[PDB]
Amino acid sequence: LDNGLLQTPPMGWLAWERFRCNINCDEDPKNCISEQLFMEMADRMAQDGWRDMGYTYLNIDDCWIGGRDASGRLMPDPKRFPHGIPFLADYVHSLGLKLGIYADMGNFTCMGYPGTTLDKVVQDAQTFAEWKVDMLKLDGCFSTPEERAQGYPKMAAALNATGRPIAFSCSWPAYEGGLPPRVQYSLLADICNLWRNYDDIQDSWWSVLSILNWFVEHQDILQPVAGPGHWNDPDMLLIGNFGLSLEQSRAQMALWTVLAAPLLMSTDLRTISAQNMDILQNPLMIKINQDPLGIQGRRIHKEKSLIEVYMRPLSNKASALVFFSCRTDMPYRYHSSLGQLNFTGSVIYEAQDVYSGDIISGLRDETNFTVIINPSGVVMWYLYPIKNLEMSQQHHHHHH
Amino acid sequence: LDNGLLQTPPMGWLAWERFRCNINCDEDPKNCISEQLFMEMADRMAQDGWRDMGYTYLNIDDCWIGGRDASGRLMPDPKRFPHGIPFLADYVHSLGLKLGIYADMGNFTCMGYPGTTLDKVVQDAQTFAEWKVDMLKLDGCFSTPEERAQGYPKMAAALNATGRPIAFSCSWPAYEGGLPPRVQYSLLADICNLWRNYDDIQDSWWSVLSILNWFVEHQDILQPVAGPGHWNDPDMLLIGNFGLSLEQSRAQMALWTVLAAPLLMSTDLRTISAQNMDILQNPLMIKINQDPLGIQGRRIHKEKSLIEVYMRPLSNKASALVFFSCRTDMPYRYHSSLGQLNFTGSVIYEAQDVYSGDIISGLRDETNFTVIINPSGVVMWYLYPIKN
Ligand SMILES: *[C@@H]1O[C@H](CO)[C@@H](O[C@@H]2O[C@H](CO)[C@@H](O[C@@H]3O[C@H](CO[C@H]4O[C@H](CO)[C@@H](O)[C@H](O)[C@@H]4O)[C@@H](O)[C@H](O[C@H]4O[C@H](CO)[C@@H](O)[C@H](O)[C@@H]4O)[C@@H]3O)[C@H](O)[C@H]2NC(C)=O)[C@H](O)[C@H]1NC(C)=O
Ligand SMILES: *[C@@H]1O[C@H](CO)[C@@H](O[C@@H]2O[C@H](CO)[C@@H](O[C@@H]3O[C@H](CO[C@H]4O[C@H](CO)[C@@H](O)[C@H](O)[C@@H]4O)[C@@H](O)[C@H](O[C@H]4O[C@H](CO)[C@@H](O)[C@H](O)[C@@H]4O)[C@@H]3O)[C@H](O)[C@H]2NC(C)=O)[C@H](O)[C@H]1NC(C)=O
Ligand SMILES: *[C@@H]1O[C@H](CO)[C@@H](O[C@@H]2O[C@H](CO)[C@@H](O[C@@H]3O[C@H](CO)[C@@H](O)[C@H](O)[C@@H]3O)[C@H](O)[C@H]2NC(C)=O)[C@H](O)[C@H]1NC(C)=O
Ligand SMILES: *[C@@H]1O[C@H](CO[C@@H]2O[C@@H](C)[C@@H](O)[C@@H](O)[C@@H]2O)[C@@H](O[C@@H]2O[C@H](CO)[C@@H](O)[C@H](O)[C@H]2NC(C)=O)[C@H](O)[C@H]1NC(C)=O
Ligand SMILES: *[C@@H]1O[C@H](CO)[C@@H](O)[C@H](O)[C@H]1NC(C)=O
Ligand SMILES: *[C@@H]1O[C@H](CO)[C@@H](O)[C@H](O)[C@H]1NC(C)=O
Ligand SMILES: OC[C@H]1O[C@@H](O)[C@H](O)[C@@H](O)[C@@H]1O
Ligand SMILES: OC[C@H]1O[C@H](O)[C@H](O)[C@@H](O)[C@@H]1O
Ligand SMILES: OC[C@H]1O[C@H](O)[C@H](O)[C@@H](O)[C@@H]1O
Ligand SMILES: OC[C@H]1O[C@H](O)[C@H](O)[C@@H](O)[C@@H]1O
Missing domain, CATH: 3.20.20.70 (Aldolase class I)
Structure with a gap:
């Protein structure tokens, strides 16, 4: 409206x-x-x-x-x-x-x-x-x-x-x-x-x-x-x-x-x-x-392990990923890579865990990573090209 | 065995x-x-x-x-x-x-x-x-x-x-x-x-x-x-x-x-x-x-309010009651009496709330009480006859 x-x-x-x-x-x-x-x-x-x-x-x-x-x-x-x-x-x-x-x-x-x-x-x-x-x-x-x-x-x-x-x-x-x-x-x-x-x-x-x-x-x-x-x-x-x-x-x-x-x-x-x-x-x-x-985001992946992955596109070529466990047993070690989640190109990424605040650095498409997801729980990342950090610091301003 | x-x-x-x-x-x-x-x-x-x-x-x-x-x-x-x-x-x-x-x-x-x-x-x-x-x-x-x-x-x-x-x-x-x-x-x-x-x-x-x-x-x-x-x-x-x-x-x-x-x-x-x-x-x-x-106890009552009542008989004329809410909205004020839950007449009871420790004393069969039950939660009483 x-x-x-x-x-x-x-x-x-x-x-x-x-x-x-x-x-x-x-x-x-x-x-x-x-x-x-x-x-x-x-x-x-x-x-x-x-x-x-x-x-x-x-x-x-x-x-x-x-x-x-x-x-x-x-x-x-x-x-x-x-x-x-x-x-x-x-x-x-x-x-x-x-x-x-x-x-x-x-x-x-x-x-x-x-x-x-x-x-x-x-x-x-x-x-x-x-x-x-x-x-x-x-x-x-x-x-x-x-x-x-x-x-x-x-x-x-x-x-x-x-x-x-x-x-x-x-x-x-x-x-x-x-x-x-x-x-x-x-x-x-x-x-x-x-x-x-x-x-x-x-x-x-x-x-x-x-x-x-x-x-x-x-x-x-x-x-x-x-x-x-x-x-x-x-x-x-x-x-x-x-x-x-x-x-x-x-x-x-x-x-x-x-x-x-x-x-x-x-x-x-x-x-x-x-x-x-x-x-x-x-x-x-x-x-x-x-x-x-x-x-609005989408579910982009569902695994036999009952782990689902959601992705939302964001400003400045960033993304949010939510790794969601529909399991009802115990914590699960989910092994993936950005390449397997349909990220392409030569971009190197960094991620911040939204709930812990922890930073994961040096993520390429090919890089294997593991997240530990609790039953009926999530792990959420804010994922950004590592060059986003440098570009944000290098904007030149003029008075108008 | x-x-x-x-x-x-x-x-x-x-x-x-x-x-x-x-x-x-x-x-x-x-x-x-x-x-x-x-x-x-x-x-x-x-x-x-x-x-x-x-x-x-x-x-x-x-x-x-x-x-x-x-x-x-x-x-x-x-x-x-x-x-x-x-x-x-x-x-x-x-x-x-x-x-x-x-x-x-x-x-x-x-x-x-x-x-x-x-x-x-x-x-x-x-x-x-x-x-x-x-x-x-x-x-x-x-x-x-x-x-x-x-x-x-x-x-x-x-x-x-x-x-x-x-x-x-x-x-x-x-x-x-x-x-x-x-x-x-x-x-x-x-x-x-x-x-x-x-x-x-x-x-x-x-x-x-x-x-x-x-x-x-x-x-x-x-x-x-x-x-x-x-x-x-x-x-x-x-x-x-x-x-x-x-x-x-x-x-x-x-x-x-x-x-x-x-x-x-x-x-x-x-x-x-x-x-x-x-x-x-x-x-x-x-x-x-x-x-x-x-x-072993049993479910003794199920209400259209989605409150269920369970009762277990115990030693020395005591009982346990569990008031269980299958509701998914908000806390519910459940109104009942021991008479409506088929307890024996002329006896005066005392109840202890198992989770809070609070004591409710002098309950007769006809005594109206209210328990507040949270959704997907319980109120549990340990109930026994008393003198006084
Ligand atoms: C009743 O319904 C009518 C529609 O039928 C509503 O009118 C619209 O109101 C909205 C919100 O106020 C207007 O949108 C605003 O337009 C501002 C001016 O733009 C003018 O100039 C451009 C030139 O290209 C024209 O194309 C355009 O039509 C306008 O004439 C913008 O400055 C506003 O921008 C806002 O968002 C940007 C984000 O990109 C911010 O940067 C700004 O700070 C700002 O917040 C905004 O887009 C819209 O123009 C109106 N439409 C029409 C057809 O008039 C009434 O609002 C509604 N009334 C009630 C009470 O509900
Ligand atoms: C291998 O399997 C055998 C056979 O099943 C087991 O032997 C039984 O063991 C149980 C438990 O110890 C015995 O049960 C107890 O018997 C006591 C007295 O029984 C006498 O009388 C009967 C005939 O009526 C005879 O068979 C028996 O030999 C005795 O002479 C009772 O006093 C006990 O009562 C308990 O319970 C009552 C209420 O239920 C309470 O009021 C009491 O306070 C008390 O707690 C009880 O009933 C049973 O008698 C044994 N049977 C036999 C044939 O020997 C073995 O235990 C098992 N071994 C292993 C290693 O698993
Ligand atoms: C528990 O284990 C026993 C013993 O291994 C099982 O019995 C065996 O089952 C196998 C596989 O089903 C049988 O082999 C098959 O036989 C058929 C007969 O023509 C053949 O076409 C197959 O290629 C294969 O060789 C095997 O004969 C049999 N052995 C014996 C001694 O009974 C049993 O099935 C298992 N039970 C359960 C409930 O899982
Ligand atoms: C919304 O209400 C209208 C108006 O009628 C009211 O509701 C009726 C159920 C009844 O209680 C009336 O006394 C009220 O005044 C409903 O329109 C009527 O619908 C009935 C069939 O149900 C029909 O026979 C009448 O001709 C209608 N009356 C008028 C004045 O148009 C309407 O159906 C109600 N809608 C819904 C979705 O409940
Ligand atoms: C990721 O793990 C697989 C085995 O599961 C392995 O074959 C592959 O080499 C790993 N990728 C990298 C970049 O190390
Ligand atoms: C208990 O409450 C009901 C109303 O639901 C009333 O009719 C009844 O008289 C009350 N009993 C006593 C003992 O106060
Ligand atoms: O595949 C995931 C499922 O594995 C089963 O072995 C477990 O019993 C479930 O609790 C679990 O959700
Ligand atoms: O409760 C779930 C959360 O627990 C911790 O904060 C973990 O570090 C985080 O990754 C997870 O999402
Ligand atoms: O009757 C109990 C039910 O009442 C309403 O329908 C509520 O929406 C529901 O959450 C509740 O459990
Ligand atoms: O969480 C449920 C419990 O909360 C409080 O302890 C109440 O006093 C008790 O009656 C109830 O069973």
């Missing part, structure tokens, strides 16, 4: 995976969907390095809506959002963050809250712009294929007409099976900044694998459609929650990064462990995810 | 899950299957509280065998076990531990090492007793059903005849589908101290769930056959390795415990985290697993 936004994948925090549709503030005031929850997460994002590392979106998901007023205007739940949404947006903006919100293109939201039907699309867009929202996720429950075909373009047009840049996240393709001919990715790229292609993620490794395997099965279709301003969205990061081991958490971060995915966390930032913070705030990982070329 | 052994489920360490068939001692000397690995694990068991908490078996699995000598006597691989097996048995015994070993009722072990064919069963039993082994795991790769039907009883008889008490772990039923009519559990109970019913565990939560689900689906058959001296074996604990989250690690420990399973770890004790050590060395958990009645 050509609205100036999301030239790199969006980074931030979304309420849904961790906090879901918890509205019992009487019994569970610390974890319920409420203005307090968002204000506290905002504070954490401003204070604990998240914003400074690039995590700028704080997004409301389903179950925020109280109803519509006498004029049809959306209102948040007054008991849970007593100061209103404008107050919340002001607060978030005061901390250098952006506010996202949620609506559904259909009769109701997936959890049964008031829907944005076709006759409310424009009014709801205008309301969100008036509240100074910065992002909209538009779900597609309780609608027909025809309503979605009309509604998603209608909302993109309505948002545009407000004059406020609002990042637009579209669930449209997930409801149509994610593939052509039912999904037209050329249109999606013109009307949305990102789109959910496939199933909702759940807090399990099986869920991550299910999503990864669908994206890889269909990468010939999906890889080319992503780029600056228009991303595939494999759904939220699970890091910090209950279902992923350490190796699995590092794997999801690495694989979402190689896929040029949004880095949308959904976890309790108030209690997140240092170990998990270190994964999400890894500066090299983030640089890779945010690479300005915005070229 | 009526040999006086394993009147409670065995506790210890088994090499297989974590270390597998790693024989590359040149490239990977710290992690290969070797005398050194077992000695180092024995040292950790003696020094870091494992033995003292009840973890007493140190078990060799596949890939130890070097060949047979001119008399057909089994030998370990001389490069990886230079001092031989008696040396290792004697070492482990000096530390107050027991040594387990591995053989296969068939032409070869599962990884292709020399097998214990029918004509070698007695000689191999005699060799193991001479070496002063304390437990034998007998796998069943590379054999026929008829060979296994002859061989497993033959080995039980041969072990007995040596005069050395050797705990006998039998993989027989796993090769025949684990169920009647092909598996006869009254026969198994007579010839084995424990048996692998089902698939090898792998380092994944999906593997744990697959095993749990098969055990629960067939619990009407499996629950009654377990007892002192004869246990169902759902395979090794994964705690300390790579595939399980913290919640899942706590869940496996609790569920194996309510199932009266062996607690056979398979993890690097040299590098195990404090958090994982605390799960495995939980004294109340171990007390429950080792309960002298040896009554």
Whole structure:
């Protein structure tokens, strides 16, 4: 979507995976969907390095809506959002963050809250712009294929007409099976900044694998459609929650990064462990995810040993490689060479291990190397021509 | 098996899950299957509280065998076990531990090492007793059903005849589908101290769930056959390795415990985290697993909320309850009462949360309680009647 936004994948925090549709503030005031929850997460994002590392979106998901007023205007739940949404947006903006919100293109939201039907699309867009929202996720429950075909373009047009840049996240393709001919990715790229292609993620490794395997099965279709301003969205990061081991958490971060995915966390930032913070705030990982070329990666190799290799092209003739073990036994010594991974030419390379920081020098196409990969885990390299180091130091500047 | 052994489920360490068939001692000397690995694990068991908490078996699995000598006597691989097996048995015994070993009722072990064919069963039993082994795991790769039907009883008889008490772990039923009519559990109970019913565990939560689900689906058959001296074996604990989250690690420990399973770890004790050590060395958990009645628990309730409740009866009118969440969303507030979980009337109970240590006192059958269960996790109670 050509609205100036999301030239790199969006980074931030979304309420849904961790906090879901918890509205019992009487019994569970610390974890319920409420203005307090968002204000506290905002504070954490401003204070604990998240914003400074690039995590700028704080997004409301389903179950925020109280109803519509006498004029049809959306209102948040007054008991849970007593100061209103404008107050919340002001607060978030005061901390250098952006506010996202949620609506559904259909009769109701997936959890049964008031829907944005076709006759409310424009009014709801205008309301969100008036509240100074910065992002909209538009779900597609309780609608027909025809309503979605009309509604998603209608909302993109309505948002545009407000004059406020609002990042637009579209669930449209997930409801149509994610593939052509039912999904037209050329249109999606013109009307949305990102789109959910496939199933909702759940807090399990099986869920991550299910999503990864669908994206890889269909990468010939999906890889080319992503780029600056228009991303595939494999759904939220699970890091910090209950279902992923350490190796699995590092794997999801690495694989979402190689896929040029949004880095949308959904976890309790108030209690997140240092170990998990270190994964999400890894500066090299983030640089890779945010690479300005915005070229989505691919799986380039799969071995009988159940080791898979993913590669993402990056700026300055660099690459990211993720060596991923689908084994379930023990650490595995994977023997390869850049030549076997379809690197050609006379380039000598160096690599930095993204998680350890260790440098491997003197890699030619023919050079045999070994990486030790843990089960359901990864090894990730930032790989660059060694001449990149010299060229970066030898740029001559003039005042203009 | 009526040999006086394993009147409670065995506790210890088994090499297989974590270390597998790693024989590359040149490239990977710290992690290969070797005398050194077992000695180092024995040292950790003696020094870091494992033995003292009840973890007493140190078990060799596949890939130890070097060949047979001119008399057909089994030998370990001389490069990886230079001092031989008696040396290792004697070492482990000096530390107050027991040594387990591995053989296969068939032409070869599962990884292709020399097998214990029918004509070698007695000689191999005699060799193991001479070496002063304390437990034998007998796998069943590379054999026929008829060979296994002859061989497993033959080995039980041969072990007995040596005069050395050797705990006998039998993989027989796993090769025949684990169920009647092909598996006869009254026969198994007579010839084995424990048996692998089902698939090898792998380092994944999906593997744990697959095993749990098969055990629960067939619990009407499996629950009654377990007892002192004869246990169902759902395979090794994964705690300390790579595939399980913290919640899942706590869940496996609790569920194996309510199932009266062996607690056979398979993890690097040299590098195990404090958090994982605390799960495995939980004294109340171990007390429950080792309960002298040896009554295997059952799943007693399954709710549309995807909360499952397991119960194990214990000594002195006590019980263990495991509240297990199969949800994959977020923590769940599970509302129940002991009356809804079929507890006996007019009794007042006290419960201890096995992981937190918190005490809940004065629970009557009608008393409503809430437990907060994390996704792919558990809450476990040790429950007993009280006066007051
Ligand atoms: C409603 O929808 C319309 C489209 O129908 C949107 O209009 C587009 O808005 C984007 C973003 O603001 C515009 O893109 C920007 O154009 C700037 C100016 O370029 C002009 O000059 C060139 C000359 O060759 C023309 O070709 C071009 O059409 C423009 O007239 C650029 O400077 C901007 O560059 C940005 O990215 C580069 C990265 O390479 C950075 O270096 C810059 O710093 C900068 O960030 C950018 O490309 C686009 O021109 C508009 N299109 C049209 C047709 O007008 C509205 O934004 C949208 N409104 C809302 C509210 O959503
Ligand atoms: C080789 O195989 C033989 C035959 O199976 C084994 O011999 C058996 O060993 C077990 C365990 O030591 C014996 O079981 C114990 O028997 C005790 C008394 O039994 C007497 O009465 C029976 C007839 O009723 C006679 O056969 C026997 O000779 C005795 O005179 C019991 O007191 C023990 O009870 C234990 O369990 C109960 C609950 O189950 C508890 O309440 C008790 O506290 C106690 O812990 C137990 O039942 C069995 O009797 C032996 N059988 C025979 C025929 O000798 C060998 O052990 C085995 N050898 C090796 C090396 O493996
Ligand atoms: C366990 O080992 C025994 C002994 O080695 C196996 O029996 C042997 O099996 C081999 C290979 O199948 C037989 O050789 C073959 O015989 C056929 C007969 O025509 C021939 O066409 C082949 O070219 C080949 O020579 C061999 O005869 C047989 N020997 C004996 C003494 O039985 C047995 O198969 C193994 N069992 C299991 C369950 O793996
Ligand atoms: C979205 O809602 C419309 C409007 O009808 C509402 O929903 C119905 C299920 C019912 O509860 C009505 O009382 C509500 O007002 C649905 O359109 C109706 O669809 C039914 C068939 O289900 C049809 O018989 C009616 O003619 C339709 N009514 C109107 C006014 O057009 C629509 O089907 C709903 N869409 C989805 C995807 O759920
Ligand atoms: C890489 O290893 C193979 C054997 O696996 C060997 O034949 C080859 O010479 C090695 N390449 C180099 C450049 O040493
Ligand atoms: C327990 O709660 C239920 C509501 O689900 C209520 O009907 C019942 O009276 C309560 N029982 C007691 C003993 O308070
Ligand atoms: O090929 C890889 C696989 O090898 C098998 O021998 C192991 O049991 C699996 O856990 C492992 O994933
Ligand atoms: O947990 C996996 C990571 O562990 C260590 O950091 C390794 O050095 C790194 O290569 C690997 O990716
Ligand atoms: O019923 C339990 C289930 O509810 C919802 O469908 C959630 O998406 C799922 O993660 C959870 O396990
Ligand atoms: O991680 C799960 C455990 O967390 C805490 O210890 C809880 O107090 C306990 O009830 C629960 O079983």
